[PDB]
Structures are given as structure tokens and as C-alpha cells.
Symmetry: C3
Subunit: 282 residues, 3 copies
């Protein structure tokens, strides 16, 4: 196997963008679950369809939106590419690399996830302190292939992927919104989906020590870290994954969208305020 | 990656079959381990080689056998396609989908498996109450790719894959055969094989909570469920998988065939009687 | 998927080698981490670049070195092919099969690994008594595909992969070198890399019962066993994999090379002496 892309391609995508916009973003945001709205908190918002950008994986609704969120230069991904849609991981995470070359130095990723930790409840937000990359164990790692040392090393470390500074500086930000539910922290486990877990699979993931399970994010994290970006991320718990054979309930997408729009308020503000904890550059 | 097949192909395979036979099957049966004989309990038996069916994956001995088992309209698969033979999962489970379009509404799958639960013994039959899909965690899920909503949803649920009604209605059926060994129930774990587990791997699968391990079935289950079929399945425990470094014994295929023919009687009758618990349609 | 190679190709590679050298090796050695030096303990050393050998996977520095190590006919692989470089496993393990056809009957494999067992320390050598093949669970097994019974069976066993005789006969050899650190024994877990484990991943691998984690070896083991070779292997623990969020340390490649050259002495001698415990043939 190898990456369909050459260093020149990432480069060429960045230069194209660097000449179709004035924005010089510092922060990449990859939204999942009702952070769709974030668009309207941006100002000086310039949209580009994925379809117009040279080299961009080809989905539908997908766009890059540059602008300012709370005095920070951002680029947000609206719509993303998942492994379960059949993309190889080197297309899943193509954008992260285009970001690094745009000059971005931080990544914020968010997602929906089922809660495996029994404490959690629908609506909780969980900070990601760590991950378990199950597709990665088997070979599905976005860095598989020849390494380009213009991005990073052959063997990067992931023990420190999720910036400790950003995690404290996001706990602070939660107090100063006065919330009833407390901010959660924990391990996100990636699995490839697209079907949902059995009870027995749920039990497996709880025994491994995961707190939430989704079908994204980790690969973009690994590529971010390979590149030198600072990473911060979190999960909206949209459902408590089913764990006994008694329950007549079932995980479904209505539940996930339902919950997404429910936290739409909470989140856009939460992320928007977090912008101020991101140190400027120079 | 994507599926080599278009909705039109599945369709075209079904119509071909629908015009080469009078049978309008309600129940699909996918046999493993000495359910080879089931053929001769069928009546009005019409055979087709896999080789003659348009689009069918291409193996050797493989045939589709339509007919009546105990007053039910069946189609049985004799020989199946495994992941370890190098088939992509969208060929492994092509038949399940052809089945749905033939009008089938139930699936019965069976297989050989090593016993991980220490209770079990060679010759035991275990009902499948749940599975652990290890290839699925990593990306090897037969639904990977664009979803066709003519079969089902993007994100189907698997918490209820194995029909509870059918499982009670199969416990009943066991009493009324007067058996010395009791009917087992449990989690089947799929792994890709084709080599057999180490002791350390055995220990891993026991800690995850599996009761039996085979190299098939799960993918056909996931595709069945995606489609709306009712699913029922079980495993013939052909060997107690090796769990300490003391034993001089080793898992082997003679053991599996040996056991298969040993339960050939038990099983054909057991499945044949189970036919009456399958509610008719309309 | 299938193997790019035909039985004829392996064959053709062996015959080519059988006519470019007088050596008729009995023992294959696949070195990792500062067994680079072993070259100079060989005598009558004949080198071949990978680049000149028909059919050999194509990397850089890679060579086959035939000769005598302590009165045994060897062939050593200097440089090997990893899964994380993007090779399919049937190229990763092409050489093992060329070895079998050269007449080799034993395989010795070594590697670097992170220590998961808290007992271990940097510099320890651990014998491999067993493995956990995580890529294998998911489908990444080098035997995936049609079986050739000229090498072995459809379904070989791995419960006895690591020769018990060789493991005792290597414990002996350790006494008779008078070492302060004792020889370790344990389960090696393969994961695909190339990134290093998170803390949460470390915890997972410890709970599964692994003692060390690397990104090689297992596939060559499975193919060796499929073929009938005797296998013996071990790991140089080059780093204690990070297991709590407190530590400011991080796994890195300098640490691995650092440690490799540190045991270069210890190992070359250790392997060289082990040669005498390998029974001759006939
Ligand atoms: O309960 C769950 N189990 C497995 N995956 C998910 C996710 C997935 N995480 C992915 C990140 O966006 C997304 O595509 C979504 O479908 C949300 N909830 C659950
Ligand atoms: O002890 C075992 N370990 C792993 N797999 C299997 C199976 C596999 N299950 C598959 C379902 O037919 C079949 O191809 C068979 O080889 C039977 N016994 C064992
Ligand atoms: O701490 C670790 N974690 C995961 N893999 C490795 C290895 C890997 N094992 C592989 C066998 O040579 C090699 O390429 C190396 O990078 C050494 N140490 C560690």
C-alpha cells in the first residue's frame, strides 16, 4: 500500500488556498455533531467547497470555512471523511496536513460518541485525555507507508497527544460558564464502524478502559501529532451504549442528531470561549 | 475501497434465480461443519452450482440447494466464502443480500468453533446470543463503503442481532429431543484466521468474554441485520482451544471434521425440527 | 486479495541463490536492534544485496549474508520489511519461504521491543515463549489467501510455535556466560505501528497479558511454522513503555538505537553460543 499523495500535492493544495484567501489561520477546527452552527460565530467568514479545492477527497455538503473565532484566525471543516465510508486513512487525514502547511499550529477536534463509562449521561461533554486506537493495532494507521521527514519522524510518540495545558485551560473555562453537569475527562476508543456495538463488544471496550467510543478523530490526531500540531479534543456523549441483554433500547442515529442540536448552544459557546486560552504565535 | 457490486448486480442475481426455480424460499441456511448432509432432508431439492449463478463469488464444491425442510421453503449454502481465503467481505456476504431479494426473511447460520468457555466440551452445541467482531473493530466490516438505503441504514444496530424469540423457541426444541448434554448459549468471537490461536491468544479471547471462536458468520450476520432479516445461529464446539503451556495437544482440522460427522445426525434433526418454530409469512 | 508470488517464484529465488553460493545454510537469522554486527562473527561470509536477488522486496541497506556461525551454516537478514512501511505481509515474509527452499530448518528471529511487564528493565533480553498477533485477529495474517500445501496446511497450529527444547537450551547458555541480569521469558505482542503506544494502549496490552510489544516478527513466525521450521526468538527490551500520565518521558528511536549498540556485545556472543545447541541435520 501507499499514500496516493506526494509531498508536492499537500504543498500545492496549501499554496492554492494561500492565494484564494487573506486568512492566515492558526487554529484548525474539525467539528462533529451540531457544531455545524459554528459557522455563524465566525466573522469575515470565507467558505470553499471541498469540490473546488485541488486534491481534496470527494464526498456531499463539505466545505472549508476560514475566519475569526473570538479573536483567533481559524479554518473549520464542516463534514469530514470516515474510514467506514471506504476512505483509506491517508485521505481521511489529508486535510490535517494541508493545515500544517497553511501555518496552523493547533488542532481542535470534536465528535459524537457513545458513553461506555457508566457515570456519563447523554449531553455530557468529555475531554479527551487519551485514546485507544484499535484500527491502528491492526495496521490501519494513517502513517503506514514511507515516512516523509518533512512532516515528522518515522516513529512518533503518542503518550502525550492531548495537550495538558489545553485540558486545564479548558477545565477553567467550564467553571466560568456556570454549568450543572460537570466537564468529563477520559479515554476515547476508535473503532471503524459503521455498525453499532453489540453488548458483548461494549463489555470489551469497557474492560479495555475506554470511556467513550466513536468512529473518527484518532487518525487526525495521529497525523496532527506527527506534524507538530498541538491537539485538543472532546466528545459529545450522545447515547449511553447498551450494556445488558435486558434493555429494549438500541443505539440509532436519530438519538445522535437529537443530542447534537441539544448541545449546539452549549458547544459553540464553549469552543468559542476556549479560543482565548489558545496562546497567540511568535 | 468499495464494494465491487452495484445494487443492480444483487438484483440481477435474484431475478436470474427467480426464473430458474419455482421455489420461493423464506429461510436461508448457511451450513458449517457436517451439516453437509442437510441436503437429503430437503424435498423437491433443486441444486445450482455457484459457478452457474451470475455474479457469485468463484471458489470448489459450492452449490445453492432450494427446497422444503419440514414444511418450510429454504435455500441452503453448501460451502461458503471466508475472509482468510482472501475474499473481501463484500464478497463473503454477497449471498445474504441475494437472499433478501429472493424474498427470504430469516437467516440460520451455523459453524464450527473452538470452545473457550471451560464448561464446554467437544460435541456441545452453543447458541449464539451475541458476538464480538474483532475484524470489525479494525475496519473489516462488510458494510464499509457507501451505504445503499435500499438495503438499510448507514449505522445499524447490532445489540439485538440474534433473535430472542428464536433462541427460546430453540431451547424448547432441545428438551423435546431428550438430550444428555444440555444446549449451550454464549458469545461467539470472530477472528480472521486461518492459523489457530496461541495459548496467549486464547487467554485474550477468554478475558474478553468470548465463549467460542470461529473464522466466519459474523459478517453474514451484520449484513443480514442491515437488511432486516431475522437471524438465528449456533456453533458446534469441535475442540477445546488449548489454554496452558503444559498440554501436548494441538488444534487441527481432523478434529474439526471428526466432530462434524459425529453431530451430523444430531444437527440435521435439530435444525430440521427448528423449522416449525419459524413463523410463516403474511 | 492475494499473494503477488507463485510457488514458482519462491522456487526460482532459491535456485538462483543455490547457484551463486556454496553455502547450504541450516539456520536463518533475522536480526533486529544491534545485531547488525553479527556479520563479523561469520566466517566465509558471502554478501548479497536484496537489490540483486530475483523477486526480493525492494527497500535501502538490505543484504543477505551467508556463512558459518560457530560451526553452523547460516544465512542472516540484515534489514527486514515491516508492515508499517506499507508492505503486504506476503512480502514481509517472502524470505522465510525462500529459506525453507534453501534447505534451512531453523529460524532465529530477534527484535527490539518496549517492556510492558513492570519487572523488565532496559537492557533485559526476553525469550519469546508466546505471542499475541493483534493484526492477525483482524485479517492481517501472512497466510491469508489460497493455501499452497507444498508449504503446509490450510489451518496450522500456533500453540507450540516457539520450540520448547530451544528455550531450555537457551536458558542453559545464559548461566554459562555468568550474567547479573537474569534471562527473561514471556509473551510478545505484535502491533502494526509505526507510531508508539498511548498510555491507555499500554494499559490495554498489559491487561491482555503481553510482556513486550514490537512491530515485527510474528508474521515471519507464522510463516516459519506453516513451513515446518523450528523457531526460536527473543527481544531486546529497549524501553519501558510509558504507563501513567505523570511521567514526562516519551518512547523514541534514539533510546532504541542507544540500547541496541549497548547489547551488541552481549547479543552477538549470546546468539553465537546458542548455535551449538542447534542440533545438526540428518
Ligand atoms: O455509540 C456509538 N458507537 C460507535 N460510534 C459512535 C459515534 C461515531 N463517531 C464518529 C465521529 O464523528 C461519527 O461518525 C459517529 O457515527 C457516535 N456514537 C457512537
Ligand atoms: O479452534 C478454532 N479456532 C479458530 N477458528 C476455528 C474454526 C473456524 N470457523 C469457521 C466457520 O466455518 C471455519 O472456517 C473454521 O475453520 C473452527 N474451530 C476453530
Ligand atoms: O516501545 C515500542 N512500542 C512499539 N514497537 C516497538 C519496537 C518495534 N519492533 C520492530 C521489530 O524490529 C521494530 O521495527 C521496532 O520499531 C521497538 N520498541 C517498541
Amino acid at each position: 500500500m501507499e499514500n496516493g499523495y506526494t509531498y508536492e500535492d499537500y504543498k500545492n493544495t496549501a499554496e492554492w488556498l494561500l492565494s484564494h484567501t487573506k486568512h492566515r489561520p492558526q487554529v484548525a477546527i474539525i467539528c462533529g455533531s451540531g457544531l455545524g452552527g459554528l459557522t455563524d460565530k465566525l466573522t469575515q467568514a470565507q467558505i470553499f467547497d471541498y469540490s473546488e479545492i485541488p486534491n481534496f477527497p470527494r464526498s456531499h455538503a463539505g466545505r472549508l470555512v476560514f475566519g475569526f473565532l473570538n479573536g483567533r484566525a481559524c479554518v473549520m471543516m464542516q463534514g469530514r471523511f470516515h474510514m467506514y465510508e471506504g476512505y483509506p486513512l491517508w485521505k481521511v487525514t489529508f486535510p490535517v496536513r494541508v493545515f500544517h502547511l497553511l501555518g496552523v499550529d493547533t488542532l481542535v477536534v470534536t465528535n459524537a460518541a457513545g458513553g461506555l463509562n457508566p457515570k456519563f449521561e447523554v449531553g455530557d461533554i468529555m475531554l479527551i485525555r487519551d485514546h485507544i486506537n484499535l484500527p491502528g493495532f491492526s495496521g490501519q494507521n494513517p502513517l503506514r507507508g514511507p515516512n516523509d521527514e518533512r512532516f515528522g519522524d518515522r516513529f512518533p510518540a503518542m503518550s502525550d497527544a492531548y495537550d495538558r495545558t489545553m485540558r486545564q485551560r479548558a477545565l477553567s473555562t467550564w467553571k466560568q460558564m456556570g454549568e450543572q453537569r460537570e466537564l468529563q475527562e477520559g479515554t476515547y476508543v476508535m473503532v471503524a464502524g459503521p455498525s453499532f456495538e453489540t453488548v458483548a463488544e461494549c463489555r470489551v471496550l469497557q474492560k479495555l478502559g475506554a470511556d467513550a467510543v466513536g468512529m473518527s478523530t484518532v487518525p487526525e490526531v495521529i497525523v496532527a501529532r506527527h506534524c507538530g500540531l498541538r491537539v485538543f479534543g472532546f466528545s459529545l456523549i450522545t447515547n449511553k451504549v447498551i450494556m445488558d441483554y435486558e434493555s429494549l433500547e438500541k443505539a440509532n442515529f436519530e438519538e445522535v442528531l437529537a443530542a447534537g442540536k441539544q448541545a449546539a448552544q452549549k458547544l459553540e459557546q464553549f469552543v468559542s470561549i476556549l479560543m482565548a486560552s489558545i496562546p497567540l504565535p511568535d
